[PDB]
Design a protein around this ligand. Structure first.
Ligand SMILES: O=c1ccn2c(n1)O[C@H]1[C@H](O)[C@@H](CO)O[C@H]12
Ligand SMILES: O=c1ccn2c(n1)O[C@H]1[C@H](O)[C@@H](CO)O[C@H]12
Ligand SMILES: O=c1ccn2c(n1)O[C@H]1[C@H](O)[C@@H](CO)O[C@H]12
Ligand SMILES: O=c1ccn2c(n1)O[C@H]1[C@H](O)[C@@H](CO)O[C@H]12
Ligand SMILES: O=c1ccn2c(n1)O[C@H]1[C@H](O)[C@@H](CO)O[C@H]12
Ligand SMILES: O=c1ccn2c(n1)O[C@H]1[C@H](O)[C@@H](CO)O[C@H]12
Lengths: 241, 242, 248, 243, 251, 244
């Protein structure tokens, strides 16, 4: 093991320079199974890694877990092993009424409601996605025929108060986030999730390419509590290889 | 007439939905002359406005002057008159050694070293360009065959201390900005300019499409102070967005 | 030619160490006309410069444009050329009920609602006027007999959201400035403006003397925008010329 | 299931009001084994939960995973199910010369270098542990005879830059965290971890009781990476004094 | 003769003392020193009055701070130079919780930092936390005396009026930051308001000094009955007996 | 016996007074009032010693503030509750500019807000600015007295040691924020360090009260760290005479 957390050596990657990075370890095998020669690499904490082949070239699929801190460990240690391009696939809650459950979202940049991004760049720095990655993700969605939305995502360190949920133990949301959902909605923000700000900032400020795609699992204008994207991200990876 | 600064009516625009927004009033007519049926509309302070036609469709060219404050006035008042798409063309000082004078840069997002962006969105909101605008801009630069870099820009409220210039009256730089250039360079930042953070934040937070393009006029790794394809690029990009 | 934006040399100034700095370029020559031996120096972007003579002493008149960014270029490059004392003349929106259109407002210090002032001093540092410049402006106003108000000014990086104007495209104001005008009013702030915070912070933190004066064109307790007119206020112009005289 | 992530009902807890919350899911079984009638409950994402008994009273053991965001999810959802007292156990890197590998550290409060704590309370509010919980941990430690240090912890959203590690892909650290380890060291800060700031802030501002204990895994005065027990006994003994 | 700029004390004055009790009021010093053996006045300059007394045969200092973090920081710093390593603050306070009664005793584990002087020792993310041994001694000493005691968080404010959301003032207005603040602190479980615990606890914790904080509740801001002078000084005395008794266990 | 909770004064005690001189040292209060007509001791509670005097037939207050903004804010507010509308501060200070001598007098136009109490009245972007009429009277009073006077910006700190970048302390340690800070204020033309002006100036300017600040230099920090009726106390009395 060349790294402290992932349990991987540089030789494990077989010259791979691109990684797909889901949140849930459960999803890693399913993503790799859509490519050639899939083999299990390692599994430690919420970091499950698999190696696959796409058009003759080595590809990594590795999970991040929930949150920026966990994400920052996986990205850093993957970068040490040779990864220069990261493609993020996740799940999300829509906050705009016209976006339906089943729709696919591509993130251009993130509202930094996290702490981990500040460990790489000050708040004035933008949490922006790589242009080539974003293009590839939009072209892939277009070829597959998925109903897709491009724009800004709010990336939060919490599931509950930072996304202004009141259905909680305290039923309370601190001053900073009181009335914040209505504010993001007016600013044209598409959705909430919990990892992109960290991923995007840390890659953009360190010479690493990153992209972000996600499937909608809930619409917050209706409820607080609740496939194509998987095909989109692997198709995008083919154009970036 | 309809607006306080620009001196324009909705009728002056004749249906225009897109605007090209340079900084210098003197470049406004030059950009308009590259398109069909160029007509001068008005001229007040920083704001010189022209109407032209591109593929039979009305287009506005309006100057912003230097800085986010005056840019925010032009953008706001054009939006009241019906503009929904804004394209900035400017000039810039590169901070990466591999970028030469005359190269073209396309901004995906800006480092917010301004004050006016905060009047539209809190600091954690990204100063990000619209994707369709950026695509057109990158595809236009490639069609004309320009040497092109795509990435992040540092957008500063000042020409001197905020860009870490020491050849000044005082010769000093405040704590915040001392050592900041080396820091931006290490973070992959391409260039310094003075307007993008304001333009990009106020558009992305109000449902307005915005893109940013600039020609390199100086490189900071050698000196503090010093037809371009940039103008051809912005006009070709505007064509694709109408 | 000695500077990058203003297109001037030290020779153009002919020994000048005081400059009057209006916002609008079209005001430069009109201000210069009230003084002896006026001549046009240069004009680039929003920097229009004229030289005049007051009691046999060389004085510069140079525009700044709208906003602190272009103000900071003008003030810096003028300082490089030899200017050590700056007097700003502008227009303003009053936020107190008793202040009338055409009243003259002299600023002691400014609420830093700008970004450029942070490029010279951290937010703790006061955006304060020079005492000698303020004295000259106050004493000059009394000599003219204008209705004068002295106090704090809020200096915003925007005309619209930062001055809590709602009649806009979005009709929306961000959390920070929502309810802000009522708060400044209660705190005794006289007016809204867009350049003083940058100017005063620049000069005070770099050993330069600065004064700030402006004439009211709208009262924000009744309307956001002044009514349009056709006919072609000047009190503040006389006051700023007379104040310079007392400073030379 | 009564909660969204954990996959637990109120009936699963059997009236439990106290939870031991390790970082690593692997530890859940081991901590539960030291108590009686231990049984598995659920496992979803980084949240593995067990239930046991201590002096005839039900106790929960539930993992949080790495970081404040994940910690905040577990703590909130356990609170909805009835948990009022939280005792965290983790691993940590020491930054004081007089603190060695294998020593046990009890946190009174944390330096807030996270983002999740701000979602509960503004920065001025202290990430402070409950006094009853801290007392139980200190006293449990002295009865086992472990080398114990009591004080402030640095709680970071990152393992690398925020803890000022330079053996990285970029080799640089951002302005804010550059020269920061030396500063914390002069301030009397004991150690580095990643979850206590979030945990202590969200409990102290919501009427919940919380304590924090960890074992020293690396000394940062001599090395960045560790490689080149007592705490588990202490946390179980502390919980026993809290029921 | 003085070893320090403000306090007017020497190391000889201390007689080898390593603990100090640090109240706010100059006039309270003599009264607290009256609960110990053989008290003698040492000095009195500005708001800083100092006395020495014996406790179980050990030298102890009692020295006032004045109101606020700035004057507290001067006193604590200059005492530390003279050789003091442990500081125990006794105060009076206003409770903001309905279940906390006038006459109750409050021990602070840590403080909400609404001061400016703590920032001169550590940035805002550092906790304004009490020393464990000092808090242990205070909680246990409270049981010896028999007080009704609450242990938790305290809001430490640089002002008595607007920072404690008081509206009965000259202006009658409260700045944006503090408008609605009392209600929010109440929800977060904050017990009370005072004016110096944030400075003291931050400056000691970040400099290798031990500090503790105890106070008696003189008023509650949720109820309408305001106690008289006699009942208030009865509460103060009750909390004063706890700080001396806690000091015994810290020698 | 008292209309206010800290000072121990009634509105009646002020006898119509609308101006107060507000020094820092309680012991110094009596000596200032002794320079005026019919001085009478009023009260003494905590760090607040108050005396009443007369100047050209008008009642004036001299009241002690104690050290620091918090203590200052209590005095100003309760004095305001009893009718005082004009405050004049007289203090001692440490100069940080080479050209300023020990014994010189400094009039403050505005302060660097290195405090916490000012934020309880106005956000940080609000200027800690003195009243123009008060500053004028102080500047003119200096001429009449005949002292060497400098007018400008003052750094107003919540501490005496770390915030004034002093290293001769127990820890010998200065926090990141204030590391190298004295050299920075110096280059920004800041005259001096004190501990009360930011709170005083901000709270008065944002509440419709008039305030002024004068001080005598007791030490120069470019030569020395620790220091060791004056001109400044004469100037504050003369200024008060001009503002009645
Ligand atoms: O509202 C939502 C719904 C889902 N997600 C998101 N917000 O946070 C992301 C977490 O990693 C994880 C938490 O369920 O899934 C993503
Ligand atoms: O280094 C540079 C060079 C050029 N520019 C930029 N920074 O600021 C932009 C100004 O609006 C304008 C005036 O400098 O030109 C752009
Ligand atoms: O309400 C107002 C009215 C006028 N002004 C002010 N606010 O901003 C100043 C700008 O420079 C310019 C913008 O019109 O004029 C000054
Ligand atoms: O230096 C260290 C060493 C260990 N830990 C800490 N920092 O972060 C904690 C993480 O949860 C997890 C990361 O390995 O373990 C804790
Ligand atoms: O509500 C209150 C009541 C009392 N105190 C507190 N808040 O502030 C403390 C001051 O030092 C001093 C001011 O009364 O006493 C403490
Ligand atoms: O450097 C200095 C010197 C003196 N002073 C000042 N700073 O702080 C003021 C304190 O109230 C008091 C404490 O010395 O005196 C004022």
């Amino acid at each position: 093991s060349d790294v402290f957390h992932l349990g991987l050596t540089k030789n494990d990657l077989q010259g791979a320079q691109l990684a797909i990075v889901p949140g849930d370890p459960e999803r890693v095998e399913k993503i790799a199974a859509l490519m050639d020669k899939p083999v299990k690499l390692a599994s430690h904490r919420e970091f499950t890694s698999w190696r696959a082949e796409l058009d003759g070239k080595a590809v990594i699929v590795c999970s991040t877990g929930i949150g920026g801190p966990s994400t920052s460990i996986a990205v850093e240690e993957l970068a040490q092993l040779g990864i220069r391009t990261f493609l993020r696939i996740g799940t999300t809650g829509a906050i705009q009424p016209h976006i339906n459950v089943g729709d696919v979202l591509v993130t251009t940049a993130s509202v930094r409601l996290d702490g981990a991004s500040l460990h790489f760049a000050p708040m004035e720095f933008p949490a922006v996605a790589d242009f080539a990655c974003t293009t590839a993700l939009v072209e892939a969605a277009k070829s597959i025929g998925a109903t897709t939305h491009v724009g800004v995502t709010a990336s939060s360190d919490t599931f509950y108060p930072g996304q202004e949920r009141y259905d909680t133990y305290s039923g309370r949301v601190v001053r900073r986030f009181k009335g914040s959902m209505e504010e993001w909605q007016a600013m044209g923000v598409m959705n909430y999730e919990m990892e992109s700000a960290t991923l995007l900032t840390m890659c953009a400020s360190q010479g690493l390419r990153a992209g972000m795609v996600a499937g909608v699992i809930v619409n917050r204008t209706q409820q607080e509590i609740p496939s194509h994207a998987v095909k989109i991200v692997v198709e995008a990876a083919r154009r970036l290889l």
